[PDB]
Amino acid sequence: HYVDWRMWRDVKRRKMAYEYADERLRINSLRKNTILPKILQDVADEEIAALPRDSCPVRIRNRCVMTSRPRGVKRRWRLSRIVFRHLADHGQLSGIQRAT
Amino acid sequence: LPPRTEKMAVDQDWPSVYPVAAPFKPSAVPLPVRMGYPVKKGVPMAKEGNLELLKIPNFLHLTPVAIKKHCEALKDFCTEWPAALDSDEKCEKHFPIEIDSTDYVSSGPSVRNPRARVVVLRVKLSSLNLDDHAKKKLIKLVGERYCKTTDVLTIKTDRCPLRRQNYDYAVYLLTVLYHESWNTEEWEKSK
């Protein structure tokens, strides 16, 4: 019952990103040090690659939570400019006023 | 039905009408107060039906009468500042250590704030039993935590999740710093 297919895809990504985060961090930690032998770093490059592609934290987009807009999103409110302006102009966003 | 403000005497006990914080009730507040930007050849809108008066965080539950009555009843919970401590000159003498901790009151379903775990310990090195070498070593160990102008060592702990754990860690840090300032290793002579 999400806004559209694109939002549902991003909700799917954020789920697996949460589940795989600890394992990714640990395997990623092995490859980011100049101590362990190169034999081990080369394999963790294979271990990290084999993990499901949507688990990568770089494939998550900050879509609007009400319109699923891909861009124009203020992260502090998770709302696109069009939805923000609607709420801010009606005085329904506490503390927000038009500047003078 | 008619509003009950018609039944209120002019010498009633107002704190009983608004004991706690409540939104503005025009049928309970017996004031002809008006709020609104008036129209041309107009008057500010009356209280009945006024949303602007309904948007004010009013202080009808805290009037001077009510504040005094509340603060008279709350005296029983207080304890007395020890008279010996007249000013800071004696507070810093009898209690050298100062522990700063902060609490945050927001509005929401959750009370957790991550900034409340930070603890700050402040102690003047002149109030510690340090000789010359001990003081020098302590200063060199602490680094920028020590300020020469004020003679104050400031240890800010935020490692642990809780605040009690950070306070314990700050006390432990002070103890270990003192004891290792009072120790002389072999490499010391290589100064």
Added chain:
Amino acid sequence: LSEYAFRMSRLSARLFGEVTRPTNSKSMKVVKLFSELPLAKKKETYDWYPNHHTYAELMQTLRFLGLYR
């Protein structure tokens, strides 16, 4: 640096719980990786969206029960 300064710094780094054994810039990434909670485990990330199933199916149930228009 100096023998005295080097030992003093390596002792202060043992009292305060920093990296005692010498290390380089690339290797200090592990410390940052494990000191901070990863982005994918932040409550701004995994709970960025409202449910939209709880919110939408609750309306469905409410209207079917005749308590919402």
Added chain:
Amino acid sequence: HVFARSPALQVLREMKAIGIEPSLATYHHIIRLFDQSFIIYDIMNELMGKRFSPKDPDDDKFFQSAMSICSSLRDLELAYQVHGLLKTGDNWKFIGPDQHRNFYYSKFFDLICLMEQIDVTLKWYEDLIPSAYFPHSQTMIHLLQALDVANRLEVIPKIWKDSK
């Protein structure tokens, strides 16, 4: 009924002697047994100033029953004593459900109107109504009769506005 009065008093004396304290339920039972009536004076005299806690399911039925007696005896000082007991501490929590509350207050206010000076009757009228209860039409008739007896006929308009 009447065969039970001395045995019940004997049982109360036994319970006191054994070291088991009476509750509001016990006094309620004794009062309702005797009312079918000067034991209420001693019961009150023993209860004055005391604070109670819920020990039996029937405790909440005391005050109602007690008030009933004060109405039948037409003893206003006893009514004030019972009300003062109710006002001591957290005693008010024993007034019971709304039906019992209305019964208690209606009998109480009827007694005030019948026996008290009219100005104190008006003070009780404003303090008790509508904050404590909503009056019954019989209470309005009683209040009007009290005003008639006290010859304060300037007040009927306000009373009728209130009844409306």
Added chain:
Amino acid sequence: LHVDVPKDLTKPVVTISDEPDILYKRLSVLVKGHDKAVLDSYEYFAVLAAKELGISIKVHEPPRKIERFTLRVQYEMRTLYRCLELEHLTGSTADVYLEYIQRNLPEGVAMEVTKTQLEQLPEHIKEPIW
């Protein structure tokens, strides 16, 4: 109430423990709002309560903060501050006063209470180890 008054009242139980009470040298109360009039009313209330409880209080106004941004249409957020410095009050007075003024905190106003507890040296730091 004119006649129907409570005969006796159950005052709360406040037990005097045997443990020592905390001492707070200072207690800084920073209240933030979007509205200056609410902060002024809250200043009046807090100061009056402090005077009535015997606490030593001094008030000042930190400079305001203005976050401007643009979506053109330019929006703004003002944050105004009021600082109440209480001084030389114990742990129990601090608890009761803070509960009172936090329970009476008006909507839209956030609070940050910084508490500077006074403590003695640990016995482990009185003298060096041999």
Added chain:
Amino acid sequence: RKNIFTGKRLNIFDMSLWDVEFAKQLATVNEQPLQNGFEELIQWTKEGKLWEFPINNEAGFDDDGSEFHEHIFLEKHLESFPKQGPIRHFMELVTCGLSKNPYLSVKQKVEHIEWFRNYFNEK
């Protein structure tokens, strides 16, 4: 003319679901409607619905009753690892990071270290 508390007595004496239900019946004896706003706040606080003042930001959270030394000194879990190899330097970095983490519990940090132990063991 004498009180009813003097006179004859029986002279006999001298000095589960059922019980919870009897307690619930006793509760109904003083079950009255709320009388004013303070009573409502008192009841909500007793139920646990309202925050207890003065606000404590760590209310209901005790970190499993752990102490500071269980968060900051995690090098007692590195006993099973190589004691002087590059693995020791790496795990020293890992524990230095984990000791500066206020967002994890001791259990999660030891779980990290145990994952590392197992992984290095397989290799």
Added chain:
Amino acid sequence: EVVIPKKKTWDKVAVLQALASTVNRDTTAVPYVFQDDPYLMPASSLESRSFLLAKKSGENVAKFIINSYPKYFQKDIAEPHIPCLMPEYFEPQIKDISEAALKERIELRKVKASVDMFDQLLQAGTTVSLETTNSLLDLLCYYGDQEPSGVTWRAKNNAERIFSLMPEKNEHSY
């Protein structure tokens, strides 16, 4: 001579109770349970009772919805956790034929299920603990072979059958 004072302790609701003791009852208002709006203030005792019953019925409908669909109210956002604002579970979770499921059904006051499972345990040859059968017989005797909402003791009711079947009848049973 720094004489540090002794700490005073009090219950979490002491301050509210002191403030409440400051304020007295309002003579010109209806009880707090109603709303001060003139259109909604009850004007008669019958009207007051009717309004209270309506409010309670609304609360009951909301409770029915919440318990009927816990999946929409399981998401917890309150710190500290509030147990009284979570859905209640009235359904058995243990489904196998075992004494623990019987104890579960007795805890849930599900009379008919408990009787049926006691019969099924008898059929499965599983010997029941004395305490468990005493708990069952508590439930049956209190509720009189009816589910939760007088009931006249019906001869040969389930309590009597269970009681007669008991291998050992201790004082608690009688």
Added chain:
Amino acid sequence: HAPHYIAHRKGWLSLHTGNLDGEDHAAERTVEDVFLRKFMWGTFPGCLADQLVLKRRGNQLEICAVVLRQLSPHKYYFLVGYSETLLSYFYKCPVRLHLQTVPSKVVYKYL
């Protein structure tokens, strides 16, 4: 009054600490506000004479609404009880409604 009078003549319908400098959870409060407004407008159809006012103090949530005297008081009480319970269990906080009836829409002018 137009949007550029929001801090000059009008106020803010919702009041909370989220948008203050240094505070957190602004987005959560905004989403809560949106659901509250939709829910109330669907649970009180044709009753609300004006906008809701959503106030937040500590853990509390006060919906101060202005309604009409068209619906019967019994239905108002039923809906208030239902809404209080449902919103309290949905947000895990003690919600509370503060209906204020007016005879009809409080007209200010004729735009």
